[PDB]
Design a protein around this ligand. Structure first.
Ligand SMILES: CCCCCCCCOCCOCCOCCOCCO
Ligand SMILES: CCCCCCCCOCCOCCOCCOCCO
Ligand SMILES: [Br-]
Ligand SMILES: [Br-]
Ligand SMILES: [Br-]
Ligand SMILES: [Br-]
Ligand SMILES: [Br-]
Ligand SMILES: [Br-]
Ligand SMILES: [Mg+2]
Ligand SMILES: [Mg+2]
Ligand SMILES: [Mg+2]
Ligand SMILES: [Mg+2]
Ligand SMILES: [Mg+2]
Ligand SMILES: [Mg+2]
Lengths: 340, 340, 340
């Protein structure tokens, strides 16, 4: 919603309220998504100011407010800043921004992160280049200096975050992506590497000086059909937990294969099919083990740009034997979303 | 404040800043309301999209930001999402919404919850059907399918919330209300019942498998006079604390009677008088005990739709002998409110 | 950004996204500012309503969202309401507001708190009258009952805040400020005094019944030149931490010297130079120690009223001998700011 648009400055306030419930067996402890109320709200702003003909300055902030906590001691649980960045965009030269923003490998992973509720399992937050991470400086060039329609590339500098936790920390790093889109078809590649922190090296799972992440995608997006595929690999970068030993760290290697199909009916219904498999290799005291393995079947019903409902069913193929203790049960999510 | 109204969709951003102080004896430890600074702020959005002639989508989110914490470690104390939900209304069929919203018994208790600052003492948060609660699906029908003006009903389903805490938990439940308003007159009744969780049955106070709550209301609201009364009862649903034994749980039974009279002068002053009593029965180790017992005298002065000030004096009739250690001292609040 | 301006009421939504990084040696543990990502966002509203010809009502709220935490357990670190207050202004008689607002000694300290990123080191939050504090009642008169242009005074009452922590608490208190501004020149004095709490007196550092603070300022602000100086003294009011003994409390006495020089080029660059020294006296198990001692060199480039970037270099003169463990390393900050 545009709340200001004068003297080249324009500001958009945005948000959504999501009534959301998950159903899984038991307390959902042994399921893909958990069980029970999962309602939440988003709020954010995105602004853009025209400094001159060739220069545009911008900022964005986006917060998540859980709506499924009580008003007591647990009120803040899961509340967080998703995005907080500012930047400058110069004509046909590129843009530069810095703050909390998406990692460059998401330029690739975005292709399949389109399910009604779940999906996008390898785009972990605070996980070097695959999702939202703090202290990234990102240079992007759209349409190749203005010469090529649909040709995009990026280079991203990741600043060390020495956090209290191995899971949420990272060393310094650099990454990049290139993508081309021609009328519905898209092709993308993205790669990042970064130092691991001493804390991360201290963990019993995962061993190495450097974390690495890469992912390629392909997509078809036209004629109401959406088809997409991602392949990626990671080294010392995917966080994992051995629920049997209560031990933690990172998978020495993973190989990740996601796939999505959706069709949009003109009356509003957009069914979805997907497949996701992420498999870990060289895990200490285990060897090879699956982290994610499921088929998804779902549908979103769009009443307009502001109102939808959805269902999303994850048929979990992880087994009860799983050596890391990865949940094996299915989850269904039903939701109703107002957005502006 | 309307920040968007195009193509069916409209969105309203709202909020208030409330400078508020409470005066009670001592540190207010043994008083109705406490002592000291109580300043807070509210922010919320609420939107409505016209999907087609008969079908409307909507969403609302509302937050409480306490203004009385330092910027240190206690910064977040008392901050919380009050409401977070999305829904649909269809023609003369009904509305359905899900998320964090008001329990259906508040359809009655709303009648007397009109004091400048205090009052509404039995509309506890996270308390099955009497106040705001998470994971409620609500159906409402207005003017009885379009057939009777003023005749309303509602049915609500409460999803189990298994929280860290007996106080903020609930099992599954179902509830409803029915109300009639003829031109300044209003009559309501509401009832709900739900499972208690194991953690709830684990507490030394209150015993029973089911929680129950009901209330009836009557109001006269015209000619600048506002009159209202509620009577209600609960079993195993009102939360209580024995400050002597430091024990908690729920009151096996309560009987609740609230009364309110206010007059609105055309120049903006609205004096208020009220009486409130909530009495617990069969409390283990005690028997009958009063939870709330007071007379209220106060006033709001309305400068306009946006600015007001108030005083609210709670003449506490609870005794010093009170067997649960309920505070016996009075409390006066003084506030100044800007709202939009 | 104006989101409402009808019928005497006007509302302005405001905020900024600040991509921001500090560079110091080491983990910045022993530096002025720290080291690493320091990004954050602000969101706020401020509103004002014209009640009648002479009476205006107003409110304001402002919140700080840190952007340099993960989305894990540390998500809330550093989030806080900065301001939350409401008030009335009457014609040429004065204004009164109550809530979380700036202490009146900030009326003077404001003079030198103009650095790109650092500076204003004596304007501690939750520290009686020198910064933003909870539960303040403030009366301000402007242009002296309408009689003298440029002449201003204020009186402020500070209500006791008995917090979990000596650092963030305060007793009841009073203060004032008076300032005169004539065409670019400005002079101010401000003084406040308050009770310490029993918890504050419990600390090993600092001893006395009353906290006191005062500051004077002088400034020249015209012809693109900004020159300012502040002198201040405190008693039992400046929070301090012995890092060696891991002990805390307040400095018995301080002497505070602040200086700033900046020039605003027409093309947007505003270089800055500054000196700050604050020295504690009579500190238990220490004697005299410097709390702050640095020279600053930086600049802000203002692209427009919406977008800027800056560098702020603190050449820290504290030494490694510092008896209180005060960091001695320098810190540089680099920021990019979108604001609306
Ligand atoms: C005395 C209250 C009358 C209102 C009853 C409404 C319907 C209640 O449904 C609850 C089912 O449990
Ligand atoms: C009346 C204006 C007084 C300002 C003094 C100038 C400050 C000098 O800059 C600080 C250099 O160090
Ligand atoms: Br959104
Ligand atoms: Br409000
Ligand atoms: Br604080
Ligand atoms: Br701001
Ligand atoms: Br920070
Ligand atoms: Br501070
Ligand atoms: Mg990280
Ligand atoms: Mg390895
Ligand atoms: Mg209250
Ligand atoms: Mg019972
Ligand atoms: Mg600072
Ligand atoms: Mg002393």
């Amino acid at each position: 919603a545009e709340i200001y648009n004068k003297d080249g400055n324009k500001v958009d306030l945005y948000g959504k309220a999501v009534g959301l419930h998950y159903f899984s067996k038991g307390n959902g402890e042994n399921s893909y998504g958990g069980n029970g109320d999962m309602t939440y709200a988003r709020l954010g702003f995105k602004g853009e100011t025209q400094i001159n003909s060739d220069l545009t300055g911008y900022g964005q902030w986006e917060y998540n407010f859980q709506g499924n906590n009580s008003e007591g001691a647990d009120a803040q649980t899961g509340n967080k800043t998703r995005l907080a960045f500012a930047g400058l965009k110069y004509a046909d030269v590129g843009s530069f921004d810095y703050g909390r923003n998406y990692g460059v490998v998401y330029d690739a992973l975005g292709y399949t992160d389109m399910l009604p509720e779940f999906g996008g399992d390898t785009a972990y937050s605070d996980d070097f280049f695959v999702g939202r991470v703090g202290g990234v400086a990102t240079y992007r060039n759209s349409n190749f200096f203005g010469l090529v329609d649909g040709l995009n590339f990026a280079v991203q500098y990741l600043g060390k975050n020495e956090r209290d936790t191995a899971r949420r920390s990272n060393g310094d790093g650099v990454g990049g992506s290139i993508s081309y889109e021609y009328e519905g078809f898209g092709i993308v590649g993205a790669y990042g590497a970064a130092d691991r922190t001493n804390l991360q090296e201290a963990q019993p799972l995962g061993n190495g000086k450097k974390a690495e992440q890469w992912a390629t995608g392909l997509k078809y997006d036209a004629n109401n059909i959406y088809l997409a595929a991602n392949y990626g690999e990671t080294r010392n970068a995917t966080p994992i937990t051995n629920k049997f030993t209560n031990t933690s760290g990172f998978a020495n290697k993973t190989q990740d294969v996601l796939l999505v199909a959706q069709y949009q009916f003109d009356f509003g219904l957009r069914p979805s099919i997907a497949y996701t498999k992420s498999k870990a290799k060289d895990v200490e005291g285990i060897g090879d083990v699956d982290l994610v393995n499921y088929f998804e079947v779902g549908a979103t019903y769009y009443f307009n740009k502001n109102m939808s409902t959805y269902v999303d069913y994850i048929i979990n193929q992880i087994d009860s034997d799983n050596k890391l203790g990865v949940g094996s049960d299915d989850t269904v999510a039903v939701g109703i979303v107002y957005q502006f």
